[PDB]
């Protein structure tokens, strides 16, 4: 809901909203949200391809 200048200063640093794990077999939820280096753009533009 916030203005987009907050959204640029938030997207570069904050973790996603419950994203998926890597390197394991099934797509698990991440709970150790301290190591995975994902940058997903599915948030900001609200899309699905």
């Amino acid at each position: 809901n916030r203005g987009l200048y907050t959204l640029v200063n938030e997207y570069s640093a904050r973790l996603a909203g419950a994203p998926a794990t890597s390197t394991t077999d099934l797509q698990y939820v991440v709970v150790n949200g301290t190591d995975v280096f994902l940058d997903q753009p599915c948030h900001m533009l609200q899309e699905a391809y």
């Binding site: 203005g3 200048y5 907050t6 200063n9």
Partner: protein, 97 residues
């Protein structure tokens, strides 16, 4: 308004809603001088605290004679506009056949 529709929209989120969080004691300055009441303060008298602010320069633009816009306009400087009402230029064209 509410954060938008304004000159300089990058300094929106910095100036408006960050300073409300921080400025609880107004301590972003450089302390330089003190006014000790008398020769010996004894930590009892009210000590005055002199501060120093941080101001940036105004972004300067050099006058347009260095710009190439001077080609578009011959520039005669003029001494009193409140004295001229309606200046004019008259052309006279003779036309052969």
């Amino acid at each position: 308004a509410t954060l938008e529709q304004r000159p300089f929209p990058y300094l929106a989120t910095e100036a408006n809603l960050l300073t409300q969080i921080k400025e609880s004691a107004a301590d972003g300055l450089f302390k330089s001088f003190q006014l000790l009441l008398g020769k010996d303060a004894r930590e009892g008298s009210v000590r005055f605290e002199a501060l120093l602010g941080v101001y940036t320069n105004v972004v300067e633009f050099v006058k347009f004679l260095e710009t190439a816009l001077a080609a578009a306009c011959v520039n005669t400087e003029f001494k009193d506009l409140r004295r001229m009402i309606d200046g004019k230029i008259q052309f006279k064209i003779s036309m052969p056949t």
